[PDB]
Design a protein around this ligand. Structure first.
Ligand SMILES: Cc1cc2nc3c(=O)[nH]c(=O)nc-3n(C[C@H](O)[C@H](O)[C@H](O)COP(=O)(O)OP(=O)(O)OC[C@H]3O[C@@H](n4cnc5c(N)ncnc54)[C@H](O)[C@@H]3O)c2cc1C
Ligand SMILES: NC(=O)C1=CN([C@@H]2O[C@H](COP(=O)(O)OP(=O)(O)OC[C@H]3O[C@@H](n4cnc5c(N)ncnc54)[C@H](OP(=O)(O)O)[C@@H]3O)[C@@H](O)[C@H]2O)C=CC1
Ligand code: HEM
Ligand code: HEM
Length: 399
């Protein structure tokens, strides 16, 4: 649920709409529905830029993409109403046919994006990228139907041009430039370690120091023969300065390729650190809940803080002893730090981690990273136990 931490972003959306709605109503009230749609298109592109200001205004990349989907759906609904009220299925003039083609592409892309979970991610992205062609066709449609009306010194022309230009620049940057210019952290793989049957640890030496906080993630691009170069999000599992650690669990073709075939000495690139689950910014009393590979951000803290400065209760649930990672590290940390309580849960041995008799310390922050249904169940239980307990969770998927 959205809170004040996203109030900067949502207000920016709201101010975007009213200013549009008040402008068209002042000049061409008959084009409120399509003009508003244009704004919601532009914002959509802006919401895909992954810029730091975006995740500062919306507090989370997950919330950024939720708003991205909301603006997409609003745009398509407004465009369908505009098409129904203005024309039909195919226009007579080229300007109308541009809008027809743009709306067809938009509807097809939204249908594929929603019902495209099982499509390969890169093919899904390539299909998604046709939004830029649809948007360019829509811009042509608008600027041929409205001629000098949008090419003069007035508020309507400046508003429409500013939003259209921002959308065009955002789309161009995210599609053509982001993977080429926004990945300045060039590193080499120095060490690889297989933690268990399906998890591998990767050590990267970078050319420049990398700044991050424990609990944050980054997008990684691997440059090796037989590997895909698309960026994948991975939680930083440790490292400081020019050294970075990533713990990758086999969850598909790319991660299986990492597990079996990734070699030392291969080139990698990283963009920057993302994430709102900064552990060091929480309260003094903390409860850490990890499920499986969701343990990765917490390890980042442990490797970087030899002496624990918080009172931390850690609950690590893993399916079996063969699915556990970093058990020796966790045991050594718990022995070294008296204020670190460790609770290992074996799902095939004892059962589910249930927060009904286990208590939450007063004025404590809960950090969760695990399977999403587990996170829902545990969040419900903890919220019922203490309504005034802060909960922060990190998801491992954008759609
Ligand atoms: C913020 C964040 C942090 C993560 N941290 C870790 C971590 O520490 N360790 C770890 O093992 N995994 C982590 N993941 C998950 C990791 O990104 C995916 O497991 C991996 O990208 C899937 O690659 P694949 O081709 O092997 O899987 P696939 O079989 O291709 O995909 C399986 C799932 O991964 C998603 N996915 C696939 N490719 C991408 C992509 N390029 N970008 C985003 N999602 C994709 C699909 O939507 C699907 O839900 C994290 C994900 C996010 C969003
Ligand atoms: N932050 C996130 O969004 C995270 C998401 N994931 C994703 O989930 C997938 C599975 O990864 P993996 O690490 O193998 O996960 P597992 O399925 O092994 O889950 C980890 C542990 O959570 C337990 N668990 C699962 N569901 C519940 C539940 N509803 N209530 C209580 N405990 C539960 C499991 O017990 P059992 O399965 O025996 O019931 C297991 O011991 C991956 O694709 C991964 O990316 C995983 C962790 C982090
Ligand atoms: C504020 C921006 C817009 C204005 C001022 C506008 C204006 C118009 C007008 C006047 C028509 C009447 C058809 C004609 O000229 O014969 C029309 C039709 C249409 N518009 Fe738009 N439009 C806008 C935005 C959009 C966008 C962004 C899309 C699609 C992505 C779109 C899709 C359509 C479609 C599909 C038609 C029907 C074409 C037909 O059958 O004749 N419009 N628009
Ligand atoms: C008018 C509608 C939409 C527009 C203009 C649009 C635009 C974009 C663009 C340009 C990108 C970046 C593509 C790239 O990385 O090359 C993107 C990413 C994304 N879009 Fe959309 N999109 C729309 C609708 C949707 C819908 C309906 C969904 C539903 C799930 C969605 C979910 C996503 C997600 C999850 C990403 C992140 C991709 C990644 O993780 O790399 N979008 N969007």
């Amino acid at each position: 649920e959205f809170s004040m931490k996203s109030v900067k972003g949502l207000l920016f959306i709201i101010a975007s709409f009213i200013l549009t709605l008040l402008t068209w109503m002042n000049t061409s009230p008959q084009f409120m529905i399509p003009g508003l749609a244009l704004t919601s298109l532009s914002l959509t592109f802006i919401l895909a830029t992954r810029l730091p200001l975006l995740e500062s205004w919306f507090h989370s990349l997950e919330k950024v993409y939720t708003v991205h989907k909301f603006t997409a759906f609003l745009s398509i609904i407004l465009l369908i109403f505009h098409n129904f009220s203005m024309g039909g299925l195919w226009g007579s003039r080229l300007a109308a046919q541009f809008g027809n083609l743009a709306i067809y592409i938009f509807a097809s892309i939204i249908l594929v994006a929603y019902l495209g979970k099982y499509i390969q991610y890169e093919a899904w992205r390539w299909i998604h990228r046709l939004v830029y062609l649809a948007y360019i066709l829509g811009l042509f449609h608008i600027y041929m139907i409205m001629g000098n009306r949008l090419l003069t010194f007035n508020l309507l022309s400046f508003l429409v041009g500013s939003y259209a230009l921002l959308g065009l620049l955002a789309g161009f940057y995210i599609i053509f430039l982001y993977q080429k210019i926004s990945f300045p952290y060039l590193g080499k793989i120095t060490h690889l370690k297989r933690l268990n049957h399906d998890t591998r640890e990767i050590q990267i030496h970078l050319s420049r120091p990398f700044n991050y906080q424990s609990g944050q993630f980054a997008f990684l691009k691997i440059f090796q023969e037989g590997f895909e170069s698309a960026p994948h999000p991975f939680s930083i599992s440790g490292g400081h300065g020019q050294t970075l650690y990533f713990t990758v669990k086999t969850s598909g073709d790319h991660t299986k390729n990492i597990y079996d075939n990734l070699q030392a000495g291969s080139k990698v690139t990283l963009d920057r650190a993302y994430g709102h689950m900064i552990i060091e910014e929480g309260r003094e009393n903390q409860v850490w809940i990890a499920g499986g590979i969701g343990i990765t951000p917490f390890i980042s803290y442990i490797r970087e803080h030899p002496i624990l400065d918080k009172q931390v209760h850690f609950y690590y649930s893993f399916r079996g002893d063969e699915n556990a990672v970093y058990l020796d590290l966790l045991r050594n940390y718990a022995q070294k730090n008296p204020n670190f309580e460790l609770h290992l849960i074996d799902s095939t041995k004892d059962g589910y981690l249930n927060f009904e008799q286990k208590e939450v310390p007063e004025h404590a922050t809960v950090y969760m990273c695990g399977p999403i249904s587990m996170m829902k169940a545990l969040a419900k239980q903890i919220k019922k136990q203490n309504p005034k307990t802060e909960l922060i969770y990190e998801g491992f998927k954008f759609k």
